[PDB]
Amino acid sequence: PETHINLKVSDGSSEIFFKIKKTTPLRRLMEAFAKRQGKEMDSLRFLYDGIRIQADQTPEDLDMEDNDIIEAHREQIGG
């Protein structure tokens, strides 16, 4: 459980498990999750413990640990 990390992405109903290198950007993971929901990337916010992940940031960048969860949230608007 050295160079690689297990991560789960969840939107609250659909959850996908991934295993990536700790130095690999989360972009591919995030795009895979969105595509499976048939949703656009710019409509979804991927958060880790409240931090809004930028695609291109890696698990190492965010101090993730094995089996951490990434939450996929819908953009919010309001008047």
């Binding site: 710019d42 919010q76 608007i77 008047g79």
Partner: protein, 221 residues
Amino acid sequence: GSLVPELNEKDDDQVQKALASRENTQLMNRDNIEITVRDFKTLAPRRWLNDTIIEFFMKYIEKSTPNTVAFNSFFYTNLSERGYQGVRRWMKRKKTQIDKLDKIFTPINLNQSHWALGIIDLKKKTIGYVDSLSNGPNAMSFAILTDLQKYVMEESKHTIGEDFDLIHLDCPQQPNGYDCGIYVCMNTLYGSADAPLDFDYKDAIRMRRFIAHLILTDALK
């Protein structure tokens, strides 16, 4: 006077150019908040702010105010839908602990149609709900106040919060249906400075341009 400044002509033109850019480019990326042109255009006149702009403004207030945490709006979503367990790990990622803070700000998205704000004042021992389109204390406002009181009690390991006063705070009301997110930002700005809430709708017009200027000038250094 007013805590919302007017932009000089040069700075205003920069905002107007950015609002017109031809394509959804990244305009800012700092302190874990990335802002694209699509997000920035929610600051155009009469437009509804989105969560990205609300989060950027929370970061700006954290950057300029001591002992303060200002969560993005997904904090209240998680706390309300998934309890304290849904936000248990969030303060740790702020690099601080609840007993060192003066205030915690929690912008609230209501049904994808309105923005309001919670203010936990640890120093005054008060939890306040401030809404710019409210007829007054109501029951939904109570669920929000008790959720924030619950957060304080759990995050502090039951050391603080049980005796806080829960209050529906008065504030200047918006005269239109699109400025709620701007009033949330003005309420955070004035509440962080402990200033009387005497802003008005002209301040809201200037606020849009002020926040846009902060983004273009990379205000989070």
